[PDB]
Design an enzyme around this catalytic site. Structure first.
Site, PDB file in Angstrom:
ATOM      1  N   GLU A 135      45.475  52.747  24.731  1.00 63.60           N
ATOM      2  CA  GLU A 135      44.736  51.849  25.616  1.00 63.60           C
ATOM      3  C   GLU A 135      43.296  52.321  25.791  1.00 63.60           C
ATOM      4  OE1 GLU A 135      45.395  48.970  26.872  1.00 63.60           O
ATOM      5  OE2 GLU A 135      47.560  48.757  26.618  1.00 63.60           O
TER       6      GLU A 135
ATOM      7  N   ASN B 131      37.915  40.762  28.714  1.00 58.42           N
ATOM      8  CA  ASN B 131      38.836  39.831  28.062  1.00 58.42           C
ATOM      9  C   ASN B 131      38.183  38.456  27.951  1.00 58.42           C
ATOM     10  OD1 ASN B 131      41.048  41.474  30.247  1.00 58.42           O
ATOM     11  ND2 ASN B 131      41.060  41.833  28.038  1.00 58.42           N
TER      12      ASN B 131
ATOM     13  N   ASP C  95      39.189  35.597  28.974  1.00 64.47           N
ATOM     14  CA  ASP C  95      39.322  34.804  30.200  1.00 64.47           C
ATOM     15  C   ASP C  95      38.358  35.267  31.310  1.00 64.47           C
ATOM     16  OD1 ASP C  95      40.460  37.172  31.155  1.00 64.47           O
ATOM     17  OD2 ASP C  95      42.326  36.265  31.813  1.00 64.47           O
TER      18      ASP C  95
ATOM     19  N   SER D 256      38.249  38.303  32.720  1.00 60.19           N
ATOM     20  CA  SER D 256      38.685  39.499  33.427  1.00 60.19           C
ATOM     21  C   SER D 256      38.282  40.745  32.632  1.00 60.19           C
ATOM     22  CB  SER D 256      40.187  39.464  33.659  1.00 60.19           C
ATOM     23  OG  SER D 256      40.861  39.422  32.415  1.00 60.19           O
TER      24      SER D 256
ATOM     25  N   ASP E  36      39.452  44.968  31.777  1.00 56.69           N
ATOM     26  CA  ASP E  36      40.446  46.055  31.889  1.00 56.69           C
ATOM     27  C   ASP E  36      39.756  47.387  32.183  1.00 56.69           C
ATOM     28  OD1 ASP E  36      42.361  44.170  31.155  1.00 56.69           O
ATOM     29  OD2 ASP E  36      42.211  44.689  29.042  1.00 56.69           O
TER      30      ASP E  36
ATOM     31  N   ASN F 216      44.106  45.448  34.540  1.00 48.59           N
ATOM     32  CA  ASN F 216      43.330  44.211  34.459  1.00 48.59           C
ATOM     33  C   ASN F 216      42.892  43.643  35.814  1.00 48.59           C
ATOM     34  OD1 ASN F 216      43.703  40.912  34.280  1.00 48.59           O
ATOM     35  ND2 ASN F 216      42.469  41.777  32.637  1.00 48.59           N
TER      36      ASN F 216
ATOM     37  N   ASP G  18      57.131  45.458  38.379  1.00 44.34           N
ATOM     38  CA  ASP G  18      57.039  44.038  38.720  1.00 44.34           C
ATOM     39  C   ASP G  18      57.950  43.156  37.874  1.00 44.34           C
ATOM     40  OD1 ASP G  18      55.864  43.599  36.198  1.00 44.34           O
ATOM     41  OD2 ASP G  18      54.092  42.607  37.012  1.00 44.34           O
TER      42      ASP G  18
END
Ligand code: BR
Ligand code: BR
Ligand code: BR
Ligand code: BR
Ligand code: BR
Ligand code: NA
Length: 129
Positions: free
Chosen positions: A35, A46, A48, A50, A52, A59, A101
């Protein structure tokens, strides 16, 4: 900070990640390698909108606030910048919420594609733990 392999392993172990939700330490070290290349300061935008952040590339659409991701939540209740610290406490605590989650470590795309189903124990081999 750019961690050494065994240095990061030891830091993660101390923060309770070893076997957290059934994921052995080598999984976490493998995910951090692909990562961020063990760099706490890593950021990536990203498509969209957002971004990271940090050693585990958490994110901004869901987990932290960076003041520039309009439709987003802040489920770890932290500024994203806290995830770039040399102290990994914030990143680890937030990762614990993420992995809990429902989707396990599949939340981390690099883990799914580069660690899952591999000999992840290799990532902590030779380390003083
Ligand atoms: Br390495
Ligand atoms: Br392991
Ligand atoms: Br925002
Ligand atoms: Br630390
Ligand atoms: Br799971
Ligand atoms: Na956010």
């Amino acid at each position: 900070k750019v961690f050494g392999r065994c240095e990061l392993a030891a830091a993660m172990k101390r923060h309770g990640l070893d076997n957290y939700r059934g994921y052995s330490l080598g999984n976490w070290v493998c995910a951090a390698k692909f990562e961020s290349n063990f760099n706490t300061q890593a950021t990536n935008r990203n498509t969209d909108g957002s971004t990271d952040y940090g050693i585990l590339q958490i994110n901004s659409r869901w987990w932290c606030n960076d003041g520039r991701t309009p439709g987003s939540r802040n489920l770890c209740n932290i500024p994203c910048s806290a995830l770039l610290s040399s102290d990994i406490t914030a990143s680890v605590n937030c990762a614990k919420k993420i992995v809990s989650d429902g989707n396990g470590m599949n939340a981390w795309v690099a883990w799914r594609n580069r660690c899952k189903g591999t000999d992840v124990q290799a990532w902590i081999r030779g380390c003083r733990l």
